[PDB]
Write a protein that holds these residues in place. Sequence first.
Motif, PDB file in Angstrom:
ATOM      1  N   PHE A 145       0.939  -1.182  -0.072  1.00 36.61           N
ATOM      2  CA  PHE A 145      -0.105  -0.190  -0.110  1.00 36.61           C
ATOM      3  C   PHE A 145       0.969   1.052   0.082  1.00 36.61           C
ATOM      4  CE2 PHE A 145      -2.499   3.461   2.122  1.00 36.61           C
ATOM      5  CZ  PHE A 145      -3.774   3.248   1.430  1.00 36.61           C
ATOM      6  N   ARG A 146       0.757   2.214  -1.000  1.00 35.66           N
ATOM      7  CA  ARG A 146       1.697   3.193  -1.315  1.00 35.66           C
ATOM      8  C   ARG A 146       0.645   4.434  -1.776  1.00 35.66           C
ATOM      9  NH1 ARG A 146       4.753  -0.304   0.685  1.00 35.66           N
ATOM     10  NH2 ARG A 146       6.982  -0.263   0.579  1.00 35.66           N
TER      11      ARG A 146
ATOM     12  N   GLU B 283      13.293  13.999 -10.115  1.00 34.48           N
ATOM     13  CA  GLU B 283      11.966  13.680  -9.353  1.00 34.48           C
ATOM     14  C   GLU B 283      11.552  11.998  -9.595  1.00 34.48           C
ATOM     15  OE1 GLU B 283       8.750  15.869 -11.522  1.00 34.48           O
ATOM     16  OE2 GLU B 283       9.962  17.778 -11.633  1.00 34.48           O
ATOM     17  N   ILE B 284      12.262  11.290 -10.395  1.00 34.67           N
ATOM     18  CA  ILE B 284      11.904   9.933 -10.444  1.00 34.67           C
ATOM     19  C   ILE B 284      12.286   9.293  -8.935  1.00 34.67           C
ATOM     20  CG2 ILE B 284      12.237   7.844 -11.502  1.00 34.67           C
ATOM     21  CD1 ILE B 284      12.272   9.233 -14.349  1.00 34.67           C
ATOM     22  N   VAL B 285      13.737   9.816  -8.686  1.00 33.65           N
ATOM     23  CA  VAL B 285      14.142   9.114  -7.681  1.00 33.65           C
ATOM     24  C   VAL B 285      13.536   9.712  -6.258  1.00 33.65           C
ATOM     25  CG1 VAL B 285      16.411   8.570  -6.354  1.00 33.65           C
ATOM     26  CG2 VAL B 285      16.462   8.570  -8.812  1.00 33.65           C
TER      27      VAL B 285
ATOM     28  N   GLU C  92      11.673   7.227  -3.451  1.00 28.85           N
ATOM     29  CA  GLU C  92      12.216   6.996  -2.099  1.00 28.85           C
ATOM     30  C   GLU C  92      10.852   7.324  -1.124  1.00 28.85           C
ATOM     31  OE1 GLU C  92      15.435  10.376  -1.585  1.00 28.85           O
ATOM     32  OE2 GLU C  92      16.553   8.469  -1.481  1.00 28.85           O
ATOM     33  N   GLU C  93       9.835   8.301  -1.568  1.00 30.04           N
ATOM     34  CA  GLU C  93       8.767   8.350  -1.090  1.00 30.04           C
ATOM     35  C   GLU C  93       7.513   7.259  -1.123  1.00 30.04           C
ATOM     36  OE1 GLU C  93       6.971  12.346  -2.478  1.00 30.04           O
ATOM     37  OE2 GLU C  93       5.640  12.500  -0.785  1.00 30.04           O
ATOM     38  N   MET C  94       8.165   6.030  -1.676  1.00 29.70           N
ATOM     39  CA  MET C  94       7.300   4.716  -1.699  1.00 29.70           C
ATOM     40  C   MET C  94       8.007   3.364  -1.316  1.00 29.70           C
ATOM     41  SD  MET C  94       5.341   5.327  -5.715  1.00 29.70           S
ATOM     42  CE  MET C  94       4.446   3.950  -5.274  1.00 29.70           C
ATOM     43  N   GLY C  95       8.973   3.862  -0.204  1.00 34.08           N
ATOM     44  CA  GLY C  95       9.740   2.628   0.326  1.00 34.08           C
ATOM     45  C   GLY C  95      10.811   2.048  -0.628  1.00 34.08           C
ATOM     46  N   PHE C  96      11.540   3.049  -1.455  1.00 32.63           N
ATOM     47  CA  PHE C  96      12.125   2.438  -2.443  1.00 32.63           C
ATOM     48  C   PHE C  96      13.489   3.216  -2.377  1.00 32.63           C
ATOM     49  CE2 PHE C  96      11.952   0.975  -7.101  1.00 32.63           C
ATOM     50  CZ  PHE C  96      13.263   0.599  -7.210  1.00 32.63           C
TER      51      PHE C  96
ATOM     52  N   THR D  71       7.085  -0.526 -10.459  1.00 34.47           N
ATOM     53  CA  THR D  71       6.723   0.867 -10.111  1.00 34.47           C
ATOM     54  C   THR D  71       7.591   1.819 -10.990  1.00 34.47           C
ATOM     55  OG1 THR D  71       5.952  -0.018  -8.031  1.00 34.47           O
ATOM     56  CG2 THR D  71       6.746   2.088  -7.998  1.00 34.47           C
ATOM     57  N   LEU D  72       8.949   1.475 -10.992  1.00 32.85           N
ATOM     58  CA  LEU D  72       9.865   2.526 -11.807  1.00 32.85           C
ATOM     59  C   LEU D  72       9.430   2.785 -13.030  1.00 32.85           C
ATOM     60  CD1 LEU D  72      12.666   4.011 -12.077  1.00 32.85           C
ATOM     61  CD2 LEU D  72      13.338   1.993 -13.209  1.00 32.85           C
TER      62      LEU D  72
END
Lengths: 221, 209
Positions: B69-70, B157-159, B163-167, B199-200
């Motif tokens: 869940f993100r 912006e991609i990275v 990072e804002e999605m537990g990545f 997701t990427l």
Amino acid sequence: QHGLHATFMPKPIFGVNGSGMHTNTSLFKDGKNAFYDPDAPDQISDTLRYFVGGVLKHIRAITAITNPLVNSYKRLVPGYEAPVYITWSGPNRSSLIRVPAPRGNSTRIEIRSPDPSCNPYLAFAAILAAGLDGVKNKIEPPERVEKNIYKLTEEEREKLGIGMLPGTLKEAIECFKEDELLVSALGEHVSQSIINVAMADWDSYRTQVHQWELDRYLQTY
Amino acid sequence: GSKEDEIFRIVEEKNVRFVRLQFVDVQGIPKNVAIPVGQLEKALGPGIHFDGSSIEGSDMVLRPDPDTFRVLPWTAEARLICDIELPDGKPFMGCPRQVLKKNMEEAAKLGYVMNTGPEMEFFLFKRQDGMPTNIPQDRGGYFDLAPIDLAEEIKREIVLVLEEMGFEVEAAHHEVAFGQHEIDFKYDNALATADNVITLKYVAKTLAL
Ligand SMILES: [Mg+2]
């Protein structure tokens, strides 16, 4: 008349074949072909090898006359029909001077280095003077290079003593300047005029900033 | 369960109004069913029904993975990676995510666990009249820096969105070809890494548009 433009420029387009003027040359002494000897091997007379030897000795200087434009040296590049290395051989392999199969009255050599932008009056005078010098002084030409030179390695070409034609117009003009035979054959008036026009073009060309430089360096630097 | 209680806390906190029940077809293309937040309890419980003919390229249930869940960083929207099961409850062996899960479980029987860290290369092209092209946005080369690399803000912006999605990303750089880029991923289990790869692609294509 047909809304087109015919040009005898040596290399009008990069990446494609350039226009050349292959001069089929034959020397006749006393009405008979001086390049023919029925008793000699292959039926080639001593006069042919001395003529070839003389032309090859002054070929670096002849290039200023036969390839007179700055563009002529963009034609003298590997990968195309045009000869770049200073060698002579039989018909099977295409070199600077090539001795075709026909014999008897059709015995001849073919000088492939000139381009159609040269002054024909001066090109033939330079070939005649250099060729007749080699016959007079009995100048033996180098060994016939029947193998392809393009496939041979750089170090191998250096071992065989194979030379290269001038890479730039300035380089050929410097060689022509020192060739006392051709300067005397063409006269001090024509020789100086060739030098003056060629160096005026070279000094203008070398200072120019070509599009290749903008394409290669403007965005990065 | 508690993971479910966690989800509903994040829903009220970030004001999530729609949830995407993400899944993937045999070809790796992301597919989804958008449901309003009122149906989130039904999705986490008995599941949402749909047509499984899309997975190939006619009736199945979407089973959301609560750990996936993100909230989409761009009213708010949220996503949930789903596994597919047949109406009876058995897992659908045509689901690519279920296939990797099986193979990982077999490896786990032998005490083996595979970790993957992919180097994701991609191109950023210009758009002409609302349609995509193959014209590079930038004229950059290998490891080039701005202004030679024009896509530095989009990659940043991609990275940041990842990072804002537990990545967590190891590094990013411009590649050899014009407009080509690479994002090097950190090590993780095969399932988490495959979820991260999907997701990427989704984030990169969304932010590029
Ligand atoms: Mg010919």
